[PDB]
From Swiss-Prot:
Primary role: The steroid hormones and their receptors are involved in the regulation of eukaryotic gene expression and affect cellular proliferation and differentiation in target tissues. Depending on the isoform, progesterone receptor functions as a transcriptional activator or repressor.
Post-translation changes: Phosphorylated on multiple serine sites. Several of these sites are hormone-dependent. Sumoylation is hormone-dependent and represses transcriptional activity. Sumoylation on all three sites is enhanced by PIAS3. Desumoylated by SENP1.
The protein's name in its UniProt record: Progesterone receptor
Comment field on protein domains: Composed of three domains: a modulating N-terminal domain, a DNA-binding domain and a C-terminal ligand-binding domain.
Source organism of the structure: Homo sapiens
Residues where progesterone binds: R83
Expression across tissues: In reproductive tissues the expression of isoform A and isoform B varies as a consequence of developmental and hormonal status. Isoform A and isoform B are expressed in comparable levels in uterine glandular epithelium during the proliferative phase of the menstrual cycle. Expression of isoform B but not of isoform A persists in the glands during mid-secretory phase. In the stroma, isoform A is the predominant form throughout the cycle. Heterogeneous isoform expression between the glands of the endometrium basalis and functionalis is implying region-specific responses to hormonal stimuli.
Superkingdom of this protein's organism: Eukaryota
Length: 247
């Protein structure tokens, strides 16, 4: 309608809701395994999605692969925030329609602590009242929010691609926002993205530790998920990548 074309395209390429396949007898092991399964399924959707994402397929194949493997985590927790904020007013973590967790289902300490950290996103969503339009644009920026220390092969086309999406976000902010109020809401939304780097870092550490101890904890990791983890997680944890900040 009165909504910009690219934002409309972004909405059309958003995947259908993904189920985890959970049963429900939730042990910590059966819960983590279900979360890795849902992740495996989300990874597939991310990749298929990036192929319709305007501008993405025009970057080097190496670059497409690097950006995906660098951002899967941030993307999955950011979309967790949306679903949570949208279906249960952000007061419950809506991983999937068959895997929604309240405070009672988070028995183990470390696990409840991880959840409390992810919960910050849907809480900001409820607070700033993030829009469907703003969300879609921000999700794309996250895909383009970290690059190799030495840069990307198609760096120029990447920088041009990222600017279009920053301009697109401003368009979505202009849908509801004034000059100072719009300029202020821009500061707010790009600061939120900035704060995700630090947020995703804790999820990474918890993930790699759970992966490395997958035998003991009896927690299974699928093939595609095991690959991105093994291929990029350690490097990222060691801070051997370049985070793109707005502030
Ligand atoms: C529990 C656990 C973890 O190990 C640490 C952070 C976690 C992820 C955080 C975000 C996420 C949102 C979803 O909607 C699908 C499952 C995924 C998660 C699966 C399990 C992880 C990554 C493998």
């Amino acid at each position: 309608q009165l909504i910009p074309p690219l934002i409309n395209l972004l909405m059309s390429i958003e995947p259908d809701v993904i189920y985890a396949g959970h049963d429900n007898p939730d042990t910590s092991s059966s819960l983590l395994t279900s979360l890795n399964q849902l992740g495996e399924r989300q990874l597939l959707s991310v990749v298929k999605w990036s192929k319709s994402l305007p501008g993405f397929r025009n970057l080097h194949i190496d670059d497409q692969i690097t950006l995906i493997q660098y951002s899967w985590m941030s993307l999955m927790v950011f979309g967790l925030g949306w679903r949570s904020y949208k279906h249960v007013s952000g007061q419950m973590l809506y991983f999937a329609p068959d895997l929604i967790l309240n405070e009672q289902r988070m028995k183990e300490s470390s696990f409840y602590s991880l959840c409390l950290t992810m919960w910050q996103i849907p809480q900001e969503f409820v607070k700033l009242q993030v829009s469907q339009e703003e969300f879609l644009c921000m999700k794309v920026l996250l895909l383009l929010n970290t690059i190799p220390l030495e840069g990307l092969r198609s760096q120029t086309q990447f920088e041009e691609m990222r600017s279009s999406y920053i301009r697109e976000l401003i368009k979505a902010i202009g849908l509801r926002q004034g000059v100072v109020s719009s300029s202020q809401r821009f500061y707010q939304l790009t600061k939120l993205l900035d704060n995700l780097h630090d947020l995703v870092k804790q999820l990474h550490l918890y993930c790699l530790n759970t992966f490395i101890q997958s035998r003991a904890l009896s927690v299974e990791f699928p093939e595609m998920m095991s690959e991105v983890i093994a291929a990029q997680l350690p490097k990222i944890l060691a801070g051997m990548v370049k985070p793109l900040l707005f502030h």
